[PDB]
Amino acid sequence: MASISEVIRVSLQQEGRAIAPDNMNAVGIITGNQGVLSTADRYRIYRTAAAVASDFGASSQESAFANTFFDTTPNPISAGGVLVIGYWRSASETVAATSATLVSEQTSESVLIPLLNAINDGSFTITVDGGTEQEVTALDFTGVSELSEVATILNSAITGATVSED
Amino acid sequence: MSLVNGMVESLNNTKSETEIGIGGYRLFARVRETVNYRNIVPTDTLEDGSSSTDDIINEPITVSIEGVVSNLFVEERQYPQLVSRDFSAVGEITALLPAKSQQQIQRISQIDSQIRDAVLAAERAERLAGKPYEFFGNSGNSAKTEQEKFIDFMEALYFSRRPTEVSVNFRDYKNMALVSFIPVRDNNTKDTRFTADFQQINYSTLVYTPVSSPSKSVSGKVSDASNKGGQNPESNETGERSLLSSLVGG
Amino acid sequence: MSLTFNENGVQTNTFSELRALLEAGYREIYGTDIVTDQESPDGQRINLETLLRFDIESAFSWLYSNLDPDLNTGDMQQIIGKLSGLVLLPASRSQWDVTINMSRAKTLPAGYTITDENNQNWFLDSDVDVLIGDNEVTFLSSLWGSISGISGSSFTQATPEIGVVSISASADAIQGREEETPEQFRLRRQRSTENPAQSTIGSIYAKLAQINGVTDLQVYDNSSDTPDQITGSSNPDILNGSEPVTIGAHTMWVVIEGGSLDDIGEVVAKHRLGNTKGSVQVSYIDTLTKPNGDDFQIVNLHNIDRPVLGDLYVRLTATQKVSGSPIDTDAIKNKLSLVDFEIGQYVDADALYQQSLITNSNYNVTDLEVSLNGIDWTDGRVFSGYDGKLSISTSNVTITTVPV
Amino acid sequence: MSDFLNQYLLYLIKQYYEKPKANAEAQLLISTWETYADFIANFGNNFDIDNAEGEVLDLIGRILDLSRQVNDVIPASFFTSKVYTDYQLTDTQYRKFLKVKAAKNICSPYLASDEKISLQQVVFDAFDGRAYVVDGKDQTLRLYVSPSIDDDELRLLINLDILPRPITFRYII
Amino acid sequence: MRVRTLDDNGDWTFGRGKADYITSKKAIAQTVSTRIKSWANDNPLAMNANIDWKDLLGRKGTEDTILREIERVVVQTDGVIRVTELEVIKTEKRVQSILLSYDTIYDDSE
Amino acid sequence: MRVRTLDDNGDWTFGRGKADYITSKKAIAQTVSTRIKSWANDNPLAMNANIDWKDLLGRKGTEDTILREIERVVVQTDGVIRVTELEVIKTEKRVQSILLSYDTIYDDSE
């Protein structure tokens, strides 16, 4: 079944255009409720009521303020602007213990894959919990078409930790 | 009538990049290029003050193109004109037709080969209705210079008495009828300076048609019951064949 | 049993079966237990689609239903009737031979109209050739049918040439034929199914029954080398036979009534291949060119016989059955009388019961029989006579009621 | 995927040729209509005197005035579909009698009639090519037959007048 | 305007009659979404159904005409008013993705 | 259009009626081939039968008009559409041979 879709696809816009507060109209609403914006996640950027709801729920007063925000007919996003929800610690935030992370460089997926597919054998040295040095000596990256696949390969290789691509 | 119809069918003629010329003959230069949208607004002050609107009768757009044709035209940046496809058998729907024996089939084959020779010319003509250039075609003979080609194509279009499609920049109007073609030849330039006024043949559909434009394979199939006038067959002479000998007895 | 054209005939699936088929398909494609089915939007949809398809299938059922000479009843009856070269007889203008008497004998074109007893026009297409004497011309009624009139002087002098004097004609009418109804056509066709056969035992019957005035018919052949026998006949009903006749070998025989002698002779002379036996002597002539390029007229003389009409006697008893609901003899007589009888056909008790009942009949029949000489009934058939047509007059149809 | 289904599915626009539910549904409609198309196409196949059994044969009888009731007894064609009484015709015999009757309906008293259809041609393809008519002397009609027909059948046809016969007839053995 | 809803992958929906129908402002969304997808000389019952793809993705130099024809199809849709559309990537391999935004007849009630 | 075939040397053919007739696409070929060969003021029943040879091969400076008239004859033929013709040799002794190519109404069924 060779679909029409592989010569044209028509879908719905998914990410909120992923813009940044550059212009003057980058307005904020500061909450104090540690629901989803904890410290080090001090802000989130939105351009529609529904997204604020999905991160905040139409019940929480923050989504209510977003609703009364975007409901203004000439609202800021109509002139190159964004809404942003902040967070001031109202009372005794408890930051849950995290696990060590390692975020890699921004890789375009158009250059990482062509360079990987020639690399027959693998080679890593990683350490988790300061344990014995782990060396990975076989990663047949030849059969890889997207970063999700190399992510899975690294996940299978690095023992004691999980590998994700994002 | 409706204000909505305006934008809707204002964009109904979109100019392709290939830039059909006077119908495919782009081998001249457009010195000037005008269109004339006109309207008849009845004059006297309209009657009611509440609803007596809907009184701007539309008009046939004319398109005037004056240009020059030389022996050697070098076209700057325009894509090739490619022959349009013969999408006639798109819905062609056989296999319900009867089972009939060989040389009963082949008799039909001979009849088909026999009248295809007499219909296929006009069939191609209707397939290429808007654009006459690739119907008449590039002249192809090395004797005729380029002004030969422009004049004989223009005469073919003019005697053709069939509407053509004409492209002003930003619009490729679909049914222009050649109204006036004046080529002029000064005695100080070997080129030909020609002014051609076309007039759109706009015609809408009065009757209920569910299908806008079907294939040739179903165009007659979805046609509504057509009407012809009466006639007195008992008073015809041009075909007054006698009664077949197989009928007088019976 | 969905739309099976089998030995059993045509079995177009019933509407419920078609709906079940479509619903089963829709159910398998979309939803095993989920999609709704009736008195519901999708259900009404399914109903519309099944309505289209069942329209077509009932058309199939009707088309095969009209492949049957005993059920056709319509145009399809004639389409199946063209399968032999016969069609329904056309309505014929009634003829009327009258005496006109004009003072001059130049010419008479189409126009005339007479006998205002009825709002009628009886025109012609021919001149007058004799003086003021009573010279006869033939008029055709303006109404195609069994039109007729009696001798009345009520002529409407439409546009008379001179208008000499009244034209009262002698009383004799040719009825004219009303267009043949399908009901007659069914029996004529099924009986005359051998029409295109050109001079066989059935060809004579089929091509004589086309004659403008014929009413009842039979054909006979004696194919044996031995005389006084009958083997081939128009109806198989008499092949049963074993009853005397007086005919010769290698001989046909026509019994016919109502046809013009000219046309009957035309058909018999065109379609006979042997000896012919009969009293009336029909004739034919034919224009043939000699190889020297001359002209002459052969006369084909052939003998046919007109049936000796007769009577028939019926021994019938009726049992009326609701206390105080007596039979009506008159209705029974007028029904049992109206049975059309074919030429020399066996009248048997066995069919006459069906004609001895009327639409709402309170009486049963328990002792019925037939006889030829007003007496001496016999429990089964009795023979009419090979050249004898029969009727059942209201006079001799005797009915005996039994009270209850 | 026969011709009917394929040529009709082209009326599915290409948004819907590949979505499985839509294609299946369109195929469902096309299939239900396709059984009617097949029925119309096979009507000719399954109707004529050859490929006819049971009621249609009887129908043909009543269209050619020949009921399966010949009131005579013929031995059985012992070389299930249908059984009748003894004194009726098993199908195949009644088929080929109806063929003979169809012939004799369009008879003519000419053995090589150039204008109209002859006796010889129509009796010959009545028996599908196992009959041969030559005249006699006292208007006898001698009739040769292939040995693939029992005497019972032919003597019955002559004894029921189903063979083509203008005035006189006979057979030969 | 009603129209039968299509599920995620875009196949048809039967059952739940009068409820698998999209009401509005989303019926326009679905109808534009798959009016774009209607190749021109496909349907024998509408041979100018929508824009001609086999003759626009198979020829060099049609991006402007792709965009003009998409605007034509969208604008000539029962329920839309305006458009705001352009190209967002530049054939990231060779496939270009264009961004199309239109104002339905709804959300103009103030 | 039917027309009696001619054999190799171009004489007429009788016999095999309805079979010595050229069917099509070759009937056009034969008919153009010998329409070129029809001198103008020959036929008393068509004195402008085809192009005038006694007044074009007997006068200097007619090559352009020879070509234009050949294009006229060919194009005005029942069954042809276009032409593509020019001169291939240059009077190798003094006879010039021109190359004539035309698209019949056939081979345009795609």
Side-chain angles (χ1 to χ4, degrees):
Chain A
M1 271 312 11
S3 296
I4 189 181
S5 285
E6 65 183 1
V7 170
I8 189 167
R9 272 141 293 159
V10 170
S11 75
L12 267 297
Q13 174 80 314
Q14 48 275 35
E15 187 91 353
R17 180 64 62 87
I19 54 164
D22 60 324
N23 202 304
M24 166 60 110
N25 315 303
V27 291
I29 301 159
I30 291 154
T31 182
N33 295 340
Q34 46 196 55
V36 67
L37 288 124
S38 298
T39 49
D41 288 32
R42 317 276 308 204
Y43 79 114
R44 284 205 183 163
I45 286 171
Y46 305 93
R47 308 166 85 265
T48 186
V52 171
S54 290
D55 291 331
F56 272 138
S59 63
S60 66
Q61 46 186 350
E62 315 179 6
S63 50
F65 273 71
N67 279 338
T68 193
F69 177 104
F70 301 111
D71 202 350
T72 70
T73 57
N75 75 62
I77 71 169
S78 53
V82 297
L83 186 146
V84 62
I85 308 285
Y87 161 55
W88 80 293
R89 272 206 314 280
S90 283
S92 175
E93 181 177 359
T94 288
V95 168
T98 196
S99 296
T101 65
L102 200 155
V103 180
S104 297
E105 280 286 28
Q106 161 90 25
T107 62
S108 306
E109 188 276 332
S110 175
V111 65
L112 199 81
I113 297 169
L115 273 55
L116 274 152
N117 309 287
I119 303 161
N120 181 281
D121 46 356
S123 65
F124 275 14
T125 61
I126 209 164
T127 307
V128 295
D129 291 331
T132 53
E133 197 186 41
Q134 194 181 185
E135 71 184 307
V136 179
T137 71
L139 298 179
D140 202 342
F141 279 109
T142 60
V144 175
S145 297
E146 60 254 9
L147 320 175
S148 314
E149 180 51 3
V150 298
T152 57
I153 284 286
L154 307 186
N155 199 351
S156 256
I158 301 171
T159 64
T162 309
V163 176
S164 160
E165 172 285 349
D166 216 14
Chain B
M1 191 265 298
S2 282
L3 174 67
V4 177
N5 297 344
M7 192 65 144
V8 175
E9 73 89 20
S10 70
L11 306 162
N12 202 5
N13 310 304
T14 187
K15 178 159 182 296
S16 198
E17 70 276 16
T18 52
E19 201 263 344
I20 58 172
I22 304 288
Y25 190 86
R26 44 200 211 197
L27 285 160
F28 65 105
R30 311 260 276 264
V31 167
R32 196 209 307 290
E33 164 180 328
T34 62
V35 311
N36 312 67
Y37 302 160
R38 274 188 31 181
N39 266 353
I40 304 173
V41 297
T43 68
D44 277 332
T45 81
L46 276 292
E47 307 213 359
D48 277 280
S50 291
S51 80
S52 282
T53 185
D54 177 46
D55 69 325
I56 298 168
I57 291 284
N58 199 355
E59 204 63 81
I61 305 156
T62 71
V63 160
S64 294
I65 293 186
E66 53 189 304
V68 294
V69 183
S70 165
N71 301 327
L72 175 76
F73 173 70
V74 290
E75 65 183 1
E76 197 71 348
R77 46 151 71 85
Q78 48 195 17
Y79 304 104
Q81 76 278 35
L82 289 176
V83 71
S84 180
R85 283 81 58 85
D86 197 25
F87 281 169
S88 73
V90 188
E92 182 172 332
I93 190 166
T94 61
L96 189 55
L97 60 84
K100 62 181 77 70
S101 72
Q102 295 280 346
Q103 172 55 254
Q104 218 164 3
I105 280 292
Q106 174 206 60
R107 219 163 273 280
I108 289 172
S109 162
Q110 271 163 348
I111 303 297
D112 272 25
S113 178
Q114 191 272 335
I115 69 170
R116 204 181 50 280
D117 201 358
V119 65
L120 187 59
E123 182 65 26
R124 182 175 65 103
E126 190 277 331
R127 184 191 78 192
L128 297 184
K131 65 179 72 66
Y133 181 85
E134 72 175 33
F135 174 82
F136 298 125
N138 306 313
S139 82
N141 83 92
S142 86
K144 283 181 174 174
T145 183
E146 186 76 320
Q147 285 167 359
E148 271 316 73
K149 286 174 216 63
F150 172 73
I151 291 299
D152 66 0
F153 164 80
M154 271 295 88
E155 300 215 16
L157 167 66
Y158 157 84
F159 285 126
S160 158
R161 307 202 271 116
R162 293 296 273 190
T164 175
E165 58 191 43
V166 163
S167 66
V168 294
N169 50 4
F170 294 133
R171 298 291 193 224
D172 62 357
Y173 295 128
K174 193 68 61 61
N175 304 319
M176 296 301 190
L178 184 82
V179 160
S180 296
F181 171 64
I182 301 168
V184 176
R185 314 216 171 71
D186 292 342
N187 79 330
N188 52 25
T189 186
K190 282 186 230 173
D191 50 27
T192 72
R193 319 189 170 266
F194 80 103
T195 292
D197 295 19
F198 311 79
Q199 189 200 293
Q200 207 174 8
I201 296 299
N202 201 283
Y203 51 93
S204 57
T205 74
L206 300 171
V207 71
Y208 171 85
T209 61
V211 295
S212 87
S213 184
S215 70
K216 284 301 304 151
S217 54
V218 290
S219 194
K221 174 181 284 198
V222 300
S223 179
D224 193 0
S226 165
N227 178 72
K228 312 296 219 259
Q231 64 188 359
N232 297 136
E234 191 184 353
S235 68
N236 267 354
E237 295 322 298
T238 187
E240 201 179 17
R241 180 182 315 241
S242 291
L243 181 63
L244 277 297
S245 284
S246 175
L247 287 194
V248 170
Chain C
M1 61 225 78
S2 194
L3 183 63
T4 300
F5 174 80
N6 204 297
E7 51 76 20
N8 221 338
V10 293
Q11 314 277 60
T12 64
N13 49 274
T14 185
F15 190 109
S16 280
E17 183 178 1
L18 196 54
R19 161 168 207 81
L21 192 50
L22 275 295
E23 191 210 306
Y26 268 80
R27 262 160 47 192
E28 192 275 6
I29 297 169
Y30 290 76
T32 66
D33 185 42
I34 297 89
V35 295
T36 43
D37 291 331
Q38 171 53 277
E39 204 164 288
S40 55
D42 73 20
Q44 302 224 0
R45 181 209 182 198
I46 307 180
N47 266 27
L48 185 43
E49 293 179 353
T50 49
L51 207 45
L52 295 188
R53 280 160 192 83
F54 193 88
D55 280 359
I56 284 298
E57 293 180 354
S58 179
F60 284 174
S61 162
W62 167 90
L63 190 62
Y64 180 84
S65 176
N66 293 24
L67 291 203
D68 196 331
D70 315 322
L71 290 88
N72 295 148
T73 81
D75 189 359
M76 187 66 204
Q77 159 64 337
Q78 298 294 354
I79 298 296
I80 211 64
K82 290 209 284 201
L83 182 49
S84 308
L86 73 165
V87 301
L88 63 83
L89 272 76
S92 197
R93 303 181 165 266
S94 43
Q95 291 187 37
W96 197 224
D97 291 324
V98 303
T99 50
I100 321 302
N101 49 3
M102 281 315 78
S103 48
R104 307 182 192 207
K106 295 296 182 181
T107 43
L108 273 301
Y112 264 111
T113 186
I114 76 165
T115 187
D116 218 350
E117 182 178 1
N118 290 318
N119 287 318
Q120 279 170 354
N121 306 269
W122 305 65
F123 54 112
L124 75 166
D125 290 323
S126 163
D127 63 348
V128 73
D129 280 350
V130 192
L131 196 47
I132 63 170
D134 318 302
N135 45 21
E136 305 176 16
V137 304
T138 300
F139 293 149
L140 295 73
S141 161
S142 290
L143 275 65
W144 270 269
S146 86
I147 304 300
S148 189
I150 311 301
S151 313
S153 195
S154 78
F155 64 93
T156 43
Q157 44 187 347
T159 44
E161 157 163 339
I162 301 167
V164 173
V165 73
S166 54
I167 61 180
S168 197
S170 173
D172 192 280
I174 292 187
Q175 302 324 111
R177 184 171 201 310
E178 160 175 327
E179 161 188 328
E180 188 195 304
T181 43
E183 296 312 318
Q184 313 175 339
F185 178 62
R186 184 168 317 157
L187 205 76
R188 165 159 98 74
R189 205 221 42 86
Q190 206 279 340
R191 191 157 169 66
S192 54
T193 188
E194 294 171 340
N195 171 38
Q198 183 158 346
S199 87
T200 194
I201 296 94
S203 307
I204 299 282
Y205 183 94
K207 194 172 321 313
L208 261 68
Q210 311 279 111
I211 298 302
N212 262 337
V214 62
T215 57
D216 271 343
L217 286 174
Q218 184 177 2
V219 176
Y220 299 78
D221 264 19
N222 170 4
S223 46
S224 167
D225 267 328
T226 294
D228 290 321
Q229 306 309 127
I230 302 184
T231 46
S233 66
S234 75
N235 57 82
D237 292 331
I238 310 163
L239 268 61
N240 308 292
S242 166
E243 282 166 350
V245 71
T246 51
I247 205 159
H250 293 323
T251 312
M252 65 179 288
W253 180 12
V254 172
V255 176
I256 174 162
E257 49 175 10
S260 176
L261 285 195
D262 174 84
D263 303 293
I264 297 169
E266 180 257 342
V267 177
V268 304
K270 292 173 153 102
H271 290 269
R272 74 81 180 170
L273 270 294
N275 186 354
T276 182
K277 162 204 182 39
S279 307
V280 166
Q281 203 144 10
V282 298
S283 87
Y284 190 86
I285 69 174
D286 46 344
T287 81
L288 291 63
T289 80
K290 313 191 196 247
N292 52 46
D294 284 16
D295 182 294
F296 64 93
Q297 323 293 114
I298 306 183
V299 57
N300 299 107
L301 293 189
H302 299 112
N303 303 318
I304 56 154
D305 197 340
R306 288 232 193 278
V308 293
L309 195 144
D311 273 298
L312 201 157
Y313 305 85
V314 287
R315 213 154 161 89
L316 199 157
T317 180
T319 294
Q320 98 291 354
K321 205 194 100 173
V322 176
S323 277
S325 297
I327 76 179
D328 43 352
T329 78
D330 303 337
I332 280 158
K333 329 296 201 64
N334 279 339
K335 181 48 167 278
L336 204 78
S337 179
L338 214 59
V339 184
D340 192 11
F341 271 62
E342 293 179 353
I343 288 313
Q345 67 100 45
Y346 291 165
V347 59
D348 45 32
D350 266 337
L352 282 197
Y353 276 70
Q354 158 77 61
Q355 294 82 17
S356 61
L357 316 176
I358 57 182
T359 177
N360 70 307
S361 303
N362 45 357
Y363 51 93
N364 288 104
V365 189
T366 186
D367 284 324
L368 180 53
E369 209 55 56
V370 297
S371 180
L372 294 174
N373 204 0
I375 211 73
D376 305 327
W377 301 257
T378 58
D379 60 350
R381 65 181 179 179
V382 76
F383 186 33
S384 164
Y386 292 102
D387 48 351
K389 187 181 78 165
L390 304 191
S391 160
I392 282 180
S393 287
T394 68
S395 69
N396 55 357
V397 63
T398 182
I399 310 294
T400 56
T401 179
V402 55
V404 55
Chain D
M1 198 171 141
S2 162
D3 272 23
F4 195 92
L5 191 52
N6 176 39
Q7 323 187 332
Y8 270 99
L9 273 194
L10 317 177
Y11 289 87
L12 273 192
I13 61 181
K14 301 162 40 198
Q15 284 104 39
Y16 304 103
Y17 201 40
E18 71 261 7
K19 310 292 190 169
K21 280 171 208 192
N23 199 359
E25 163 172 17
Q27 271 189 33
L28 190 79
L29 316 186
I30 304 299
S31 163
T32 304
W33 281 125
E34 196 271 337
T35 188
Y36 304 151
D38 285 348
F39 176 100
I40 288 176
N42 298 350
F43 203 101
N45 182 359
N46 201 154
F47 176 62
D48 66 309
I49 188 59
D50 282 49
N51 304 343
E53 310 166 320
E55 300 308 323
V56 288
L57 284 187
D58 294 331
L59 182 144
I60 298 301
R62 290 190 335 263
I63 193 164
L64 302 182
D65 183 53
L66 204 76
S67 179
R68 292 194 264 87
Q69 203 28 41
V70 299
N71 214 303
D72 202 310
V73 58
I74 58 177
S77 311
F78 207 101
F79 275 76
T80 71
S81 164
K82 181 63 172 71
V83 64
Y84 299 106
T85 68
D86 202 79
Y87 304 90
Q88 284 159 326
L89 283 72
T90 49
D91 273 15
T92 81
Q93 298 157 327
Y94 182 75
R95 316 182 334 148
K96 60 167 290 259
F97 280 2
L98 296 184
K99 262 193 283 195
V100 140
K101 186 55 175 154
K104 165 278 191 171
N105 288 318
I106 196 154
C107 186
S108 65
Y110 317 113
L111 280 74
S113 158
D114 293 329
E115 306 305 325
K116 312 203 200 66
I117 189 173
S118 79
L119 187 153
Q120 191 68 279
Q121 201 155 354
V122 71
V123 62
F124 169 88
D125 287 329
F127 290 80
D128 271 324
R130 303 152 307 257
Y132 180 31
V133 174
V134 202
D135 314 333
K137 304 150 177 173
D138 210 356
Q139 267 208 274
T140 302
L141 268 289
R142 255 200 171 180
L143 172 47
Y144 308 95
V145 305
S146 75
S148 86
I149 295 179
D150 63 358
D151 197 81
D152 203 69
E153 180 187 315
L154 292 175
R155 73 173 270 291
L156 185 51
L157 282 72
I158 293 157
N159 284 337
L160 298 178
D161 183 355
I162 308 188
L163 288 168
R165 184 195 51 144
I167 296 303
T168 51
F169 205 51
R170 195 183 69 88
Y171 68 106
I172 193 168
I173 61 170
Chain E
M1 57 194 284
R2 282 204 181 57
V3 63
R4 321 200 52 94
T5 186
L6 303 131
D7 60 357
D8 295 2
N9 52 357
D11 63 40
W12 283 334
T13 60
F14 175 79
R16 334 281 298 286
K18 187 174 302 307
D20 282 334
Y21 272 67
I22 312 175
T23 65
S24 73
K25 183 189 185 313
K26 179 182 319 183
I28 301 159
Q30 186 272 342
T31 198
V32 175
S33 178
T34 186
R35 283 192 69 189
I36 304 304
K37 307 168 60 192
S38 275
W39 299 21
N41 285 18
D42 183 359
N43 180 0
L45 293 165
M47 201 80 76
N48 63 7
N50 275 326
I51 61 172
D52 191 25
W53 291 69
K54 191 172 159 192
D55 200 358
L56 282 180
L57 299 195
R59 292 205 337 258
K60 238 169 166 159
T62 57
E63 292 90 29
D64 272 305
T65 51
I66 299 298
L67 294 196
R68 291 208 214 74
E69 271 292 3
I70 280 149
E71 185 170 19
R72 192 195 67 71
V73 166
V74 171
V75 172
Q76 294 180 358
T77 291
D78 304 290
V80 304
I81 295 172
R82 286 192 223 76
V83 294
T84 305
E85 60 88 9
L86 60 87
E87 63 196 11
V88 63
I89 319 177
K90 189 60 181 68
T91 66
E92 184 171 357
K93 239 9 186 184
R94 190 178 288 273
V95 59
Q96 83 178 331
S97 69
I98 81 172
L99 182 149
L100 166 57
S101 34
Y102 61 86
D103 274 68
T104 70
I105 193 66
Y106 303 72
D107 210 337
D108 273 350
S109 290
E110 268 70 3
Chain F
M1 57 195 284
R2 282 204 181 57
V3 63
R4 321 200 52 94
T5 186
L6 303 131
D7 60 357
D8 295 2
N9 52 357
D11 63 40
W12 283 334
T13 60
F14 175 79
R16 334 281 298 286
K18 187 174 302 307
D20 282 334
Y21 272 67
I22 312 175
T23 65
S24 73
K25 183 189 185 313
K26 179 182 319 183
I28 301 159
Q30 186 272 342
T31 199
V32 175
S33 178
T34 187
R35 283 192 69 189
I36 304 304
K37 307 168 60 192
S38 275
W39 299 21
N41 285 18
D42 183 359
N43 180 0
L45 293 165
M47 201 80 76
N48 63 7
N50 275 327
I51 61 172
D52 191 25
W53 291 69
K54 191 172 159 192
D55 200 358
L56 282 180
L57 299 195
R59 292 205 338 258
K60 238 169 166 159
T62 57
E63 292 90 29
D64 272 305
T65 51
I66 300 298
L67 294 196
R68 291 208 214 74
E69 271 292 3
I70 280 149
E71 185 170 19
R72 192 195 67 71
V73 166
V74 171
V75 172
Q76 294 180 358
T77 291
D78 304 290
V80 304
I81 295 172
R82 286 192 223 76
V83 294
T84 305
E85 60 88 9
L86 60 88
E87 63 196 11
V88 63
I89 319 177
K90 189 60 181 68
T91 66
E92 184 171 357
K93 239 9 186 184
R94 190 178 288 273
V95 59
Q96 83 178 331
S97 69
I98 81 172
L99 182 149
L100 166 57
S101 35
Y102 61 86
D103 274 69
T104 70
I105 193 66
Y106 303 72
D107 210 337
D108 273 350
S109 290
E110 268 70 3

